[PDB]
Amino acid sequence: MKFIDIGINLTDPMFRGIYRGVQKHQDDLQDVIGRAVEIGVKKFMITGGNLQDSKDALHLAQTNGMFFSTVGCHPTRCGEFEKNNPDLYLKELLNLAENNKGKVVAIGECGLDFDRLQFCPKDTQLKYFEKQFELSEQTKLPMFLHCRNSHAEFLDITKRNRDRCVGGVVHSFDGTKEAAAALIDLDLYIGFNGCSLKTEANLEVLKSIPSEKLMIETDAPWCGVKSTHAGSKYIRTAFPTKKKWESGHCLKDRNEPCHIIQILEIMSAVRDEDPLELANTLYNNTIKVFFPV
Numbered sequence: 001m002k003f004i005d006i007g008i009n010l011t012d013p014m015f016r017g018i019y020r021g022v023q024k025h026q027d028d029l030q031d032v033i034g035r036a037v038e039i040g041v042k043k044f045m046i047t048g049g050n051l052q053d054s055k056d057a058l059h060l061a062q063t064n065g066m067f068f069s070t071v072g073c074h075p076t077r078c079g080e081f082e083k084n085n086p087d088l089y090l091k092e093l094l095n096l097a098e099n100n101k102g103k104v105v106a107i108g109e110c111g112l113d114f115d116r117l118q119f120c121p122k123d124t125q126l127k128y129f130e131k132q133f134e135l136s137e138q139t140k141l142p143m144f145l146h147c148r149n150s151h152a153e154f155l156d157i158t159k160r161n162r163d164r165c166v167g168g169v170v171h172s173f174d175g176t177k178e179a180a181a182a183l184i185d186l187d188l189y190i191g192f193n194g195c196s197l198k199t200e201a202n203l204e205v206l207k208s209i210p211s212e213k214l215m216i217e218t219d220a221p222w223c224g225v226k227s228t229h230a231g232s233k234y235i236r237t238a239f240p241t242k243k244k245w246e247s248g249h250c251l252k253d254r255n256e257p258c259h260i261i262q263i264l265e266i267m268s269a270v271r272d273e274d275p276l277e278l279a280n281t282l283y284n285n286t287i288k289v290f291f292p293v
């Protein structure tokens, strides 16, 4: 099979064995990358969520021809516009994307998260998500979008500004069938990781989406599938794992890009579709949006 992980936090210190500035185990990032390559991951989109993190994502993406990155400001970080001067901050994000055309493939992560108002209030989130359509309009890059507990406001901004972006994906989607149908009507794609598959209602929503509008991702080291999640029973491929780090083993409770196969197994069993046929469609959809040239 072949995969493109549209949302992988490859810069996370967990992949270097680092926990709050402390070396807990040997840096195993290259081993993590190697396990993902072995299962068929061909490209990795390393997510950026503010100016500095987008620079960090780009700097890691420059280390390997399989790696790419995004530039944008996550809803939880949108206080950085007023802190730094909003027009300067926007221009810094714009320059970072425009000067790095090979590696930067999307504007984002951006959108809304009304379960995280303690990090950035609603008004600031709405204002600065909408402002980022200046980045998509100028760069002609597709968007990598976030929506939690905010469909109505998210749809309003996206629908009003649809002609200001070439396309995009609503990643780690966890909304209703009506929300998914409204997003597909705007010619947007729907991304699934483990966090999109936790409930029985999430599985039913997945069934309602045409396969030509789906993408796949892990959000590793987060969103690992747990037995309490509705789709866990469908996972078939396991990896050697240890609770205390050991060479050649995954670390218990740390998700990795290789675990994208488990997301594929869930999606294909839920939809009653051949696993490779669905994997190939997901790959082709991702190329069309993020790698068409």
Ligand code: NA
Pocket (backbone or CB within 6 Å): 226, 227, 228, 229, 230, 231, 232, 233
């Ligand atoms: Na389960």
Ligand code: NI
Pocket (backbone or CB within 6 Å): 240, 249
């Ligand atoms: Ni072993």
